């Protein structure tokens, strides 16, 4: 259930939570998922995105 993240692609705010669209490392783009911010352990990828 924990996986290496490759890139943070997008961000949204839904139902009171920030969610990020993640491209998982080694997985095709058809496996991308939105994940709430509490699930993320990739602060430097969020930072790259926020540029």
């Amino acid at each position: 259930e924990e996986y290496v993240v490759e890139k943070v692609l997008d961000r949204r705010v839904v139902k009171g939570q920030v969610e990020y669209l993640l491209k998982w490392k080694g997985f095709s783009e058809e496996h991308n998922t939105w994940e709430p911010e509490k699930n993320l352990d990739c602060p430097e990828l969020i930072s790259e995105f926020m540029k």
């Binding site: 996986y3 993240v5 490759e6 993640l22 998922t33 994940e35 993320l40 352990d41 990739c42």
Partner: peptide
């Protein structure tokens, strides 16, 4: 001790 960029998938 090297870091990795990770996340839990719902």
């Amino acid at each position: 001790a090297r870091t990795k960029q990770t996340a839990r998938k719902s």
